Structures are given as structure tokens and as C-alpha cells.
C-alpha positions as a Markdown table, in Angstrom:
| # | Residue | x | y | z |
|---|---|---|---|---|
| 1 | Ser | 38.8 | 64.0 | -45.9 |
| 2 | Met | 38.3 | 61.9 | -48.8 |
| 3 | Glu | 41.7 | 63.2 | -50.0 |
| 4 | Gln | 43.5 | 61.7 | -46.5 |
| 5 | Val | 41.5 | 57.9 | -46.6 |
| 6 | Ala | 42.5 | 57.6 | -50.4 |
| 7 | Met | 46.3 | 58.4 | -48.9 |
| 8 | Glu | 46.1 | 55.8 | -46.6 |
| 9 | Leu | 44.6 | 52.9 | -48.8 |
| 10 | Arg | 47.7 | 53.6 | -50.9 |
| 11 | Leu | 50.2 | 53.1 | -47.2 |
| 12 | Thr | 48.2 | 50.0 | -46.5 |
| 13 | Glu | 48.7 | 48.7 | -50.2 |
| 14 | Leu | 52.0 | 49.4 | -49.8 |
| 15 | Thr | 52.6 | 47.9 | -46.4 |
| 16 | Arg | 50.5 | 44.2 | -47.8 |
| 17 | Leu | 53.5 | 43.9 | -51.3 |
| 18 | Leu | 56.4 | 44.9 | -48.0 |
| 19 | Arg | 54.9 | 42.4 | -46.0 |
| 20 | Ser | 55.5 | 39.6 | -48.9 |
| 21 | Val | 59.0 | 41.4 | -50.2 |
| 22 | Leu | 59.7 | 40.7 | -46.5 |
| 23 | Asp | 58.6 | 37.3 | -46.9 |
| 24 | Gln | 60.8 | 36.4 | -49.4 |
| 25 | Leu | 63.9 | 38.6 | -48.4 |
| 26 | Gln | 63.7 | 36.4 | -44.9 |
| 27 | Asp | 63.5 | 33.0 | -46.7 |
| 28 | Lys | 66.6 | 34.0 | -48.3 |
| 29 | Asp | 67.9 | 33.6 | -44.6 |
| 30 | Pro | 67.2 | 29.7 | -43.8 |
| 31 | Ala | 69.8 | 29.9 | -40.9 |
| 32 | Arg | 68.3 | 32.9 | -39.2 |
| 33 | Ile | 70.9 | 34.6 | -38.8 |
| 34 | Phe | 69.0 | 38.0 | -39.5 |
| 35 | Ala | 66.2 | 37.4 | -37.7 |
| 36 | Gln | 66.8 | 39.1 | -34.5 |
| 37 | Pro | 68.9 | 41.7 | -33.4 |
| 38 | Val | 72.4 | 41.3 | -32.4 |
| 39 | Ser | 71.8 | 40.5 | -28.4 |
| 40 | Leu | 73.5 | 43.3 | -26.2 |
| 41 | Lys | 74.3 | 40.7 | -23.6 |
| 42 | Glu | 76.2 | 38.3 | -26.0 |
| 43 | Val | 78.0 | 41.2 | -28.3 |
| 44 | Pro | 78.3 | 43.5 | -25.8 |
| 45 | Asp | 80.7 | 46.0 | -27.2 |
| 46 | Tyr | 78.0 | 46.0 | -30.6 |
| 47 | Leu | 76.9 | 49.7 | -30.6 |
| 48 | Asp | 80.8 | 50.8 | -30.4 |
| 49 | His | 80.9 | 49.0 | -34.0 |
| 50 | Ile | 77.9 | 49.6 | -35.3 |
| 51 | Lys | 75.8 | 52.9 | -34.7 |
| 52 | His | 72.1 | 51.8 | -36.6 |
| 53 | Pro | 71.7 | 48.0 | -35.8 |
| 54 | Met | 68.9 | 46.4 | -37.8 |
| 55 | Asp | 67.5 | 42.9 | -38.4 |
| 56 | Phe | 64.3 | 41.5 | -40.0 |
| 57 | Ala | 61.8 | 41.5 | -36.5 |
| 58 | Thr | 62.6 | 44.9 | -36.5 |
| 59 | Met | 61.1 | 45.8 | -39.8 |
| 60 | Arg | 58.4 | 43.6 | -38.8 |
| 61 | Lys | 57.3 | 45.8 | -36.4 |
| 62 | Arg | 57.9 | 48.7 | -38.2 |
| 63 | Leu | 55.7 | 47.3 | -41.1 |
| 64 | Glu | 52.8 | 46.3 | -39.5 |
| 65 | Ala | 53.2 | 50.3 | -37.7 |
| 66 | Gln | 52.8 | 51.1 | -41.4 |
| 67 | Gly | 56.2 | 52.4 | -40.8 |
| 68 | Tyr | 57.5 | 52.5 | -44.0 |
| 69 | Lys | 56.1 | 55.6 | -46.8 |
| 70 | Asn | 57.9 | 54.2 | -49.8 |
| 71 | Leu | 60.3 | 51.1 | -51.0 |
| 72 | His | 63.1 | 53.4 | -50.6 |
| 73 | Glu | 63.1 | 53.6 | -47.0 |
| 74 | Phe | 62.5 | 50.0 | -46.7 |
| 75 | Glu | 65.3 | 49.2 | -48.8 |
| 76 | Glu | 67.7 | 51.1 | -46.8 |
| 77 | Asp | 66.8 | 49.1 | -43.8 |
| 78 | Phe | 67.5 | 45.9 | -45.3 |
| 79 | Asp | 70.8 | 47.2 | -46.6 |
| 80 | Leu | 71.6 | 48.4 | -42.9 |
| 81 | Ile | 71.2 | 44.3 | -42.3 |
| 82 | Ile | 73.4 | 43.5 | -44.8 |
| 83 | Asp | 76.0 | 46.1 | -44.8 |
| 84 | Asn | 76.6 | 45.8 | -40.4 |
| 85 | Cys | 76.8 | 42.1 | -40.8 |
| 86 | Met | 79.9 | 42.8 | -43.3 |
| 87 | Lys | 81.5 | 45.4 | -41.2 |
| 88 | Tyr | 81.4 | 43.8 | -37.9 |
| 89 | Asn | 82.1 | 40.5 | -39.3 |
| 90 | Ala | 85.5 | 39.4 | -41.0 |
| 91 | Arg | 85.2 | 38.0 | -44.6 |
| 92 | Asp | 85.9 | 34.2 | -43.6 |
| 93 | Thr | 82.9 | 34.0 | -41.1 |
| 94 | Val | 79.8 | 32.1 | -41.5 |
| 95 | Phe | 77.8 | 35.6 | -40.6 |
| 96 | Tyr | 80.0 | 37.8 | -43.6 |
| 97 | Arg | 79.3 | 35.0 | -46.1 |
| 98 | Ala | 75.6 | 35.0 | -45.1 |
| 99 | Ala | 75.3 | 38.6 | -46.0 |
| 100 | Val | 76.9 | 37.9 | -49.1 |
| 101 | Arg | 74.0 | 35.2 | -50.2 |
| 102 | Leu | 71.4 | 37.8 | -48.7 |
| 103 | Arg | 72.8 | 40.7 | -50.7 |
| 104 | Asp | 72.8 | 38.5 | -54.0 |
| 105 | Gln | 69.4 | 36.3 | -53.6 |
| 106 | Gly | 67.6 | 39.7 | -52.1 |
| 107 | Gly | 68.6 | 42.0 | -55.4 |
| 108 | Val | 66.8 | 39.8 | -57.4 |
| 109 | Val | 63.2 | 40.1 | -55.1 |
| 110 | Leu | 63.9 | 43.7 | -55.0 |
| 111 | Arg | 64.2 | 44.4 | -58.9 |
| 112 | Gln | 60.9 | 43.3 | -59.6 |
| 113 | Ala | 59.3 | 44.5 | -56.1 |
| 114 | Arg | 60.9 | 48.0 | -57.6 |
| 115 | Arg | 59.0 | 47.5 | -60.6 |
| 116 | Glu | 55.5 | 46.3 | -58.7 |
| 117 | Val | 55.8 | 49.6 | -56.6 |
| 118 | Asp | 56.0 | 52.0 | -59.7 |
| 119 | Ser | 54.0 | 50.1 | -61.7 |
| 120 | Ile | 51.0 | 50.3 | -58.9 |
| 121 | Gly | 51.5 | 53.3 | -57.8 |
């Protein structure tokens, strides 16, 4: 139907906007601490600590399958990146500190992304 196509166009437009949000968020992680999943070879116990792991590569695979229906879904995954890191790692670590900086800097980007998703429907 034409209605299905139109909904598909909206999903595609959202996907384009989220790809740019994701690039902007990832630039706030120049050390690439959050680029890839935590390795179970190198942290074999990781899943005893963290139930829903997340990373920018895994978000990117979801995005390119148009797997985010709205900004809320995408923000949930971003928040998992940060929140997982701040539980597993201690406060005095390079990892925790990188999460805090990503959170603070990403908040600015997401503040305007929320206005752009509302605004352009």
C-alpha cells in the first residue's frame, strides 16, 4: 500500500538522522573505548556482571538494518553503553571517566536530536 511506503520513507529518514547522531556521539569517544563489544576472551566473567552489553558497532549494525523505530530506542542503547561501563568499572579508571565525558558531551547532541525528530515528524 501507499500508507506502508510512506511509513517506510519515515523510517528511512529517521535512519539517516540517527546515523549522523551516531557519528557525532562516537566522535565524543576519541579513545575508541566504546567502539566494539567487550571481549569475552579478555573479560570472561563479563556477562555475570552486565546483562545487556552494548557498544557503538552493535548500534551501527542495528541502525543499518533500520532497527530503530524511534529516538527513544536509540537513546536506550546509548545509555546502556554508559551505564554498563559505570557499573563494571570503578570511578578512578580511565574507562569510567571516558563514560562520564561521553554522557556529558552526548547530552548536548541528543538534546537537539530530540528537537529535530519531533520537528521533522
